[PDB]
Every structure is written in structure tokens, then in C-alpha cells.
Write a protein that binds this ligand. Structure first.
Ligand SMILES: *C[C@@H]1C(=O)C2CCN1CC2
Ligand SMILES: *C[C@@H]1C(=O)C2CCN1CC2
Ligand SMILES: *C[C@@H]1C(=O)C2CCN1CC2
Ligand SMILES: *C[C@@H]1C(=O)C2CCN1CC2
Ligand SMILES: *C[C@@H]1C(=O)C2CCN1CC2
Ligand SMILES: *C[C@@H]1C(=O)C2CCN1CC2
Ligand SMILES: *C[C@@H]1C(=O)C2CCN1CC2
Ligand SMILES: *C[C@H]1C(=O)C2CCN1CC2
Ligand SMILES: [Zn+2]
Ligand SMILES: [Zn+2]
Ligand SMILES: [Zn+2]
Ligand SMILES: [Zn+2]
Lengths: 192, 191, 190, 192
DNA sequence: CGGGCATGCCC
DNA sequence: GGGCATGCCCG
DNA sequence: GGGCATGCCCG
DNA sequence: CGGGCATGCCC
């Protein structure tokens, strides 16, 4: 079954935050609140903030998974194109989404659905901060032929206990493109 | 190594011909550039013109190479995406160049140079015709990532005997694109 | 014995020309007239123009050779550093030890001189398509490489030769291979 | 190549390392980073402290590995320039990064199975009136050497072993070989 | 930092 | 055919 | 000890 | 694009 994308704050008040990087043409990543859509470049750092009202228990994990947004493509596993599949020392070459700068990263190929995901332990924010940040990398362009092939995707962020039970969920659309600033302005202008 | 490009009409007067830039054209040839513009997997007719007919057993080989000397040693092959596609029943999935409509087509993977080539027997022109046309197919765009990767290529057409000895050679540049008529006008106007 | 660097226009009025690309920090190759010095990045295209008053005969060749500019280093052969001489930058035609390559010419020829041990690269002269024939040189080590040039400045000598090697003309220019030619040209000119 | 263990192991003899007290200085050790900053080919003293005297024939082996997990499987060796510099003392083969000075009983190993380099000397008990044994190490490449360590930080693994090579103890410390150890220690400390 | 264009694709 | 979608070369 | 030389990084 | 850091080296 297609994994759920429904927003769910859960008993810890789980919410996502994003950096507000603007729409300069050269911007490596930028988030559009009006679209709830992240625009980023291939393999560049894509910060995602985790916000909670109450700290989840030790053993809590944070999983990221991509699915196709269009209903006719939702049952197809999101994976890297054959060119980019051919790197780093921790992530499987087939996985679209990586976590950088975290040696506790763990990747999953699902036994039943064959979907890819990446999971890290939830770590509480630093003494001064009010949120925890994960540095994601997207390893294919949305336009990659033989891969996403111009099909829009969503990234589903799930807060899990140690057993994998759901504690909270949030999602956002992603476009991996060469020009995130240009493309965000173009789509937001097309809301008019 | 690097195969020869030298035009060589040889003992039989071997030369190439091409049919005769709108944005609908499946293929278009530029005499000014000696360059064929064609779309992926669409008919690319090349005419064989000879002054004298070659003997029975003569073969016609086609091979692609990169035009730039910095890439000329790299084997031209299909990109990873299209390699994973669309066979006609005989063409191996990694070969860039195919021949359509010839049951006697042979595809060669050289055991030593690793270069790909496609070979058909030479047929004399039909009654009333003064040339023999072979319908080639290019199975990747010049821009295909992980393949030609926007590098221009040349197609080398060689006339060979059954033993592989050279009888004649010609060549032409080729760009496999989505809008051949458009790119031909741009290149001819950027000179 | 050090190869000659004496400018000689010869019977064909042989001069060099360079593209004027400014001093932006990311410029891949820029020429300073005040210094007669080329600032370029490693393995990037460095255009050198050949200007002649009359077309030299067929068979004419164009050779490029690097020598150290300082007199106390002039007898040392300019070569790549031990690190770079082990890469795979091949290009299919160039020797791994040679500092200077020509890109985009299948008729390129490289020489290790049997007597002087010096490296040079030669291409056939081809008439302009332009008022000038351009050769695309690549320099395969930074001026600062340890065990190679080691921050010593070099001169590139361009010689026009007939098919037998006789001198038809000669010109030269200083070269710095660096990460940021735009920044370094400004610093050296200041 | 498989990565040698870095696990601290005091062993039956309570083996531990010590360092002398610390911008013109040739070497300096930072307790906050467990990191040694030293100059190329300069004396880098390392103290051996034991609670009990190991048996005769015990040896002390030093081996370098890259600290980052990405480069951990790569053998640490001298850059091509320094390997050709012929700056040998007469004992160390030119490819070895780590040398021992002032000990003619030194032995250098090019492991036939792992291809790792190491340098080993006999363990000498502390002299009368002393509490530790000092080995004077030399590092023959800067951390920044192109074609060698190439700005990748390394760890030095010191092992105590018997005559046959069996492990008796292990410690480790990060090391940066640079031109100005005092400047670079101050810089790295001040970034924490 | 990115302007300008290459190149697939849709109307 | 006009124009958009979307990557990238070189400063 | 400043401070420059110079490869590199970062968007 | 430049700003500026990393880092060997010079006064
Ligand atoms: C949104 C709802 C809930 O509150 C839980 C988790 C997700 N769905 C179904 C049950
Ligand atoms: C949009 C992207 C960028 O960030 C710069 C300017 C245009 N493209 C390629 C490089
Ligand atoms: C969400 C948190 C904070 O409180 C500040 C700004 C972004 N992160 C890290 C520090
Ligand atoms: C040039 C090509 C074609 O053949 C049609 C019309 C314009 N483009 C895309 C489809
Ligand atoms: C040298 C010649 C010319 O006259 C211009 C500038 C560079 N080349 C080609 C065109
Ligand atoms: C000067 C060099 C370059 O060309 C760019 C900008 C600054 N450095 C590194 C990348
Ligand atoms: C840091 C190093 C030193 O040890 C002295 C002073 C500054 N540099 C070069 C010499
Ligand atoms: C081992 C220890 C001692 O006993 C003195 C000499 C060396 N080290 C510091 C002081
Ligand atoms: Zn891809
Ligand atoms: Zn393809
Ligand atoms: Zn070098
Ligand atoms: Zn070194």
C-alpha cells in the first residue's frame, strides 16, 4: 500500500521548519511556504528542522521517504536514474535521499514495498536551540530521464519510536533542479 | 586507438549521398557542415554511390566516433537509460547505430578495440536507381547524460571485402536531437 | 645549453596574440600585457594566437616549450610534479610528464629531446579559418606544485619551424598556472 | 584495505599515553582534542605509561590511519614528492609517514596482507627515577601534502604487543602535521 | 555570485 | 512554428 | 608575531 | 562573481 502522507502532529507536537533562503538565482536550496515545496540542487545540503512541543523518548527515530505526488505514479518506487546510480561511503547508490554529516545514518530497502528510506536517531536540540536540523541530500534531478522523469515527488518525514510505530508525520513537495531560485519564483508566479 | 576518417573512394568510386530545415523534419542534412541532423530512433537514410559495382560478399560497416580528439579514444555507446530500454530483435541494447529493414544485418562488438559497429551486405542499386540507400537509426540523443553527453560524433561508413579489407571510406558528422531543423539553422548561422 | 628565447618575427612576420578576458577571479585564462604574462588554470584551455604577415609554406610546424625564467634555474628541465605525473588525465595522446599539452589537435606530436631531455609539443601550422591561427594549450601543473616548478616562474617559447626543423620565427611569454588567475594577475600587477 | 582497530585498550599492564606540556613551537599537544600538532620531520615525543612492566620482548608499534570513515580504508602513505626526496636517515624506507629517531633497533613493516605501514621498536622500561618511557616520533609529510594525506586528518595508533605480535594494549591520538602547530592548535581549539 | 544559451519538449 | 522547461558553461 | 602566497570552499 | 578560509612560508 502507498505510504501515508497525511500530516500528523502526534502527542509530541511534531512539526517541520525550513530555512528561508530567498529566491536569488544562485540559491542552493529554498522553501516555498505558499506551495509547501522545497526547491534544491542535486547533492546540495537541504536543511530540514524538526520542531516538537515535548521531547520524544530515547530511541525515537526520524525517517525520510520519497513518493510520487501524482496518483497515477504513487505505486512506483522513487529511485535514482540509471546514470546517477552508477558517491559516499554510507548511502546505497540507488537511494534518492541521503543524510549528510551523520554517522548514525541507517538506510532501508523495504522487504514488502521495496521503497527506499533513510532514518536517523532523533537527537534533542542543543542547549540554546529550539529545533533539531537534519541535512538531507537529493541525488537526482526531478528531470532525470529514467528516474523521476519530471514527475513531482513528496518527501514524507516520520517520527518513529524504536519499534517503528508512528509518532508524528509531516510532508513537503520537492523539486530537485539546477535553479531553485528561478523555479520557485516561476511556480509561485503561476499561482496568480 | 583512433580509426581513420580519411575519405577514400577507392577502386569503385565510393561516395555518400543524402536527401534534401523546418522544425518538423525527422532528419536533415547540412552540406555546408557535412552534418546529419536526425531524431532518436527515426530513419536516417544514407545513399551509397559507386562508379563500379563491388564484388559479391562486399559489406558496408557503420561506426561512430567522437569528433573531438580529447574524446576520440572513448567508445561511443548508448547512455545508461536507453541501454535499459526497444530492441528490433537483433540489435544489442548498447549499440548506438542500428540498420532497419535488413534481415542480413550483423552487429559487431570488436574483441580488441571494444568499438561497436553494424554491418550489412552491399546490395547493388535497384533497377532504375543509381544508388543504394541504407536506413540507419541512432538510438540516443547527442545530449544523453552518461552517453554521448553533448559531445559531437562522426559516423564512419566503410566498404569492406568479406575478409575485412578496406575498399572505401566516407564519413559525416551527426547530431541526434529533438528538433533537427532548428539546430541545423542555428549551427549554420553561428559560423 | 638553454634553448633560445630571442624574439624573431622572421620572413613571415610571426607574432603572438592573446585573448583579453579581464581579471574576474574565476576567469580560466587571462593575459597581462604589462607583464607579457599568461595567467591560467591547470588543464584549462589557454588560447594562443599566431599572427603572420604572410602564410608560411605547407609543412610548417609550431612548437611550444617551457623553460625556467630565472637564470639560476634555466638549465633545469621544466616537468610536471611527481603527484600530477601520476594522474589519468591522459587525453589519449599526451605523455604524463609533459607540462604543456595541445588540446583539440589529433596531429599533435610530443618530444622528449634525446640530448637536452627537454619536453616540447608541436602541431602542424594551419592557416586561419580569422586573421589568426589559434592553438589551445593546456598547462598540467600549477606554478606552485611541490617537486615541479615549485613557485618558479616559467617562459613558454613558441617557435615556427619548417618541416625539417629549421627556425622560421620565435616568440615567448611568461606563464603562471594558478587556481585564480584573475586574482593573481591583479596582485602581480600591483 | 581493512581498518585496524582503534579501540583504547589499557590491557593487563595498564598501558596509556602521555604528552609533554606545550607560535614558534615545533610541536604541541591539545588535551581538549587529544590531538598532537607537530612540524614535518621534527621530534614528536610520545610518553608510554604502564602500571606493570610488560614481559621482555614486548614491542611498541605505531601506525597511522585516516580519521574520517570515508577515507579509513585508504593506506596512509607519504606523498609522491616527499617519497622521492631521499631525505632518509638510512633506516626508514621512503614510503613511510611515521619514523622513530634515536633508536637503531627500529623496524619498519610493509604489511604483505593489509599494505599498511608501521614502525616498531622494543619496549624499554622506564629508567630508575622515571615514571614513563619516551619514543621520539617523526612525521615525514604535512597533513596538507597533495597526493598524500591531502588535508585529511589522521590518527596514530600505538599498540603494545608481545614478541609474536599478540596485542597487549592500544591507545591513539589525532595528529596534524603542519607548518605552525601553535597557530593551528589555537585555531582548532577556538572553534569549539 | 550568475547571465546567457543549449536542448528537450509542449502548444 | 513560438515559446516554455530546464540543465550548464564560463566569468 | 603579523602578513603575504595560494589552493580551496561556499555558496 | 568575490569574500574568505586553509595553510605553507616570509619577515
Ligand atoms: C491522522 C490519524 C491519526 O491521528 C493516527 C495516525 C494517522 N492517522 C490515523 C491514526
Ligand atoms: C540557476 C543555476 C545557478 O545557481 C547558477 C546560475 C544559473 N544556474 C547555473 C549556475
Ligand atoms: C530551530 C533552531 C533554532 O532555534 C536556531 C535557528 C535554527 N535552529 C538552530 C538554531
Ligand atoms: C522539433 C520537435 C518536433 O519534431 C516536434 C515540434 C517541435 N519539437 C518537439 C516536437
Ligand atoms: C585571431 C582571429 C581573429 O581575427 C578574430 C579573433 C581571434 N581569431 C578569430 C577571430
Ligand atoms: C579562483 C577560483 C575559481 O575559478 C572559482 C572562484 C575562486 N577560486 C575557486 C573557484
Ligand atoms: C609558524 C611557523 C613557525 O614555526 C615560525 C613562525 C611562523 N611560521 C614559520 C616560522
Ligand atoms: C617519564 C617522565 C619522567 O619521569 C620525566 C622524564 C620524562 N617524563 C617527564 C618527566
Ligand atoms: Zn539522475
Ligand atoms: Zn540515451
Ligand atoms: Zn603538479
Ligand atoms: Zn609530503
Amino acid at each position: 500500500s502507498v505510504p501515508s502522507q497525511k500530516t500528523y502532529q502526534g502527542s509530541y507536537g511534531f512539526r517541520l521548519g525550513f530555512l528561508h533562503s530567498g529566491t536569488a538565482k544562485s540559491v542552493t536550496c529554498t522553501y516555498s511556504p505558499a506551495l509547501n515545496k522545497m526547491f534544491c540542487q542535486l547533492a546540495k545540503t537541504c536543511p530540514v528542522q524538526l520542531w516538537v512541543d515535548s521531547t520524544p523518548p530515547p530511541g525515537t527515530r526520524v525517517r525520510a521517504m520519497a513518493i510520487y505526488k501524482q496518483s497515477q505514479h504513487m505505486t512506483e518506487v522513487v529511485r535514482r536514474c540509471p546514470h546517477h546510480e552508477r558517491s559516499d561511503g554510507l548511502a546505497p547508490p540507488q537511494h534518492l535521499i541521503r543524510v549528510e554529516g551523520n554517522l548514525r545514518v541507517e538506510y532501508l530497502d523495504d522487504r514488502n514495498t521495496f521503497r527506499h528510506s533513510v532514518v536517523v536517531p532523533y537527537e534533542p536540540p542543543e542547549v540554546g536551540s529550539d529545533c533539531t536540523t537534519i541535512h538531507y541530500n537529493y541525488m537526482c534531478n526531478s528531470s532525470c530521464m529514467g528516474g523521476m522523469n519530471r514527475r513531482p515527488i513528496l518527501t514524507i518525514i516520520t517520527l518513529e519510536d524504536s519499534s517503528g510505530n508512528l509518532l508524528g508525520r509531516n510532508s513537503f513537495e520537492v523539486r530537485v533542479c539546477a535553479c531553485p531560485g528561478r523555479d520557485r519564483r516561476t511556480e509561485e508566479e503561476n499561482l496568480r
